[PDB]
């Protein structure tokens, strides 16, 4: 059965022009843009078991000393958390005659390499935004698994991460989220283990000699594609996400974006002091709606913004509150409910 595993002959026929030469210009039509992996800071773990974060969980609150009293000495407690890196790689397996009869090798390698690069980038962004290693044991913890719980009330100071998520009333499979990460030496950053290298590493293995279980030695060619990284959210005061954003709304005038964004901005307890570069990543539905509520035309019972000629259409959504708004396609408009912590 199958027919989907290796690069069959039909695909090679499809990847060439009518003149009989392999196509140099391939329409992707499935590439995505994800600058999270571009603006992210990453450095080698360069340590033992893993990257280490030290969190304080106790204060030596002073005592109202009466005169002739012995104040009991106090200690400051600390809590430690470590985060690990993850590794994935993908391989290309093609018959050598599949190459030779295509009259062109380097072109076929270029096409397959570009496709593999795009695939890995998309996969990596998807796992960064959703690394639910709770049920994986690989695919290092991303961002959604850490904040996949919100607390409705009592969200005064960041006692847990359930105070870093804002309900928006959504329901159904049309929910989404907005992340506002801060990349910095202490805020949060990417991570790769020592000895390896940053970014995607690709290796051309040349002609192989694929040996079959039942005595078969047909000759194949392979390319290596390797890229590993890990995350470390040192502070849950540096990441705030909005849950239950129902896309049945947000296209009509039912949920105001800037209301939730300001609510979250003030939930970001560590923008009062510069820790590092900030960002607010969206899914291009949020940005569409944001330009729909920042340059309003015939909007529904709202939008105190008052327009002028030459400014009736809209300009851009580049910066939220000085935070650059980088548009990341990895985010999905289906995320399932993030529940309310009781």
């Amino acid at each position: 059965t199958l027919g989907n595993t290796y690069l069959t002959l039909a695909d090679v026929q499809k990847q060439k022009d009518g003149k009989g030469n392999v196509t140099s210009e391939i329409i992707e039509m499935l590439a995505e843009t994800n600058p999270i992996l571009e603006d992210m800071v990453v450095m080698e773990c360069n340590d033992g078991t893993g990257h280490l974060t030290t969190i304080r969980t106790g204060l030596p609150q002073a005592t109202w000393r009466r005169l002739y009293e012995g104040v009991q000495p106090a200690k400051s407690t600390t809590r430690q958390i470590k985060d690990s890196t993850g590794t994935l790689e993908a391989w290309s397996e093609v018959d050598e005659k599949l190459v030779k009869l295509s009259k062109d090798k380097q072109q076929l390698m270029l096409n397959e390499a570009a496709a593999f690069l795009e695939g890995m980038n998309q996969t990596m962004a998807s796992t960064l935004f959703y690394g639910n290693t709770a049920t994986d044991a690989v695919k290092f913890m991303g961002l959604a698994p850490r904040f996949n719980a919100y607390r409705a009330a009592r969200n005064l100071k960041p006692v847990d991460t359930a105070d870093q998520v804002i309900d928006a009333g959504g329901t159904g499979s049309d929910l989404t989220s907005i992340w506002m990460v801060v990349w910095g030496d202490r805020t949060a950053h990417g991570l790769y283990p020592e000895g390896t290298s940053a970014g995607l590493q690709r290796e051309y293995l040349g002609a192989e000699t694929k040996e079959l279980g039942d005595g078969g030695v047909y000759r194949v060619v392979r390319e290596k594609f390797e890229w590993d990284l890990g995350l470390t959210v040192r502070d849950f005061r540096y990441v705030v996400r909005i849950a239950n954003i129902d896309v049945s709304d947000l296209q009509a005038g039912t949920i105001d974006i800037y209301a939730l964004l300001r609510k979250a901005y003030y939930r970001l307890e560590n923008r009062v002091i510069t820790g590092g570069r900030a960002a607010l990543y969206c899914n291009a539905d949020v940005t569409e709606a944001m330009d729909a509520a920042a340059t309003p035309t015939s909007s529904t019972t709202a939008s105190y913004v008052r327009l002028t000629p030459m400014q009736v259409d809209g300009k851009e959504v580049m910066m939220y509150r000085g935070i650059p708004v980088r548009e990341c396609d990895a985010i999905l408009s289906t995320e399932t409910a993030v529940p309310s912590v009781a």
Binding site: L9, A10, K14
Partner: protein, 129 residues
């Protein structure tokens, strides 16, 4: 011909009874591969048929591993056994249009057969005369 292993529906399959193809070519994405540059196919009968009567040779396509509901893209009709010799093609030259998700070949036979085989599958370039 340089017909290869993977995208091949059946290799010398007897289908003497009312059987179906074995290697169901499955594609995750509905490419509908016939468009643009063509892809040659064969359902050429590879060894003669003895006591069959009809060999309806549908090219059923469906949207599930098991073909719960299938769609026909090429049917040879009730070809009488008098023509089921070697080289008797049973469908069009190149890939048809409409290959939605999965592809398996049916071999409805009127009555049973004591001999018969086919080599339906994708070919890089046809052989003619």
């Amino acid at each position: 011909m340089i017909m290869d292993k993977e995208n091949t529906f059946s290799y010398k399959q007897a289908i003497t009874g009312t059987a179906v193809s074995t290697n169901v070519i499955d594609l995750g994405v509905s490419r509908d591969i016939g468009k643009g540059v063509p892809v040659p196919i064969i359902i050429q009968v590879v060894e003669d048929f003895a006591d069959a009567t009809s060999l309806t040779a549908t090219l059923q396509t469906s949207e599930t591993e098991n073909f719960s509901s299938a769609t026909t893209l090429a049917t040879s009709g009730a070809v009488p056994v008098a023509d089921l010799t070697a080289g008797k093609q049973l469908a069009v030259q190149y890939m048809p249009l409409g290959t939605q998700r999965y592809l398996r070949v049916n071999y409805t036979v009127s009555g049973t057969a004591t001999a018969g085989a086919v080599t339906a599958g994708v070919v890089m370039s046809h052989q003619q005369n």
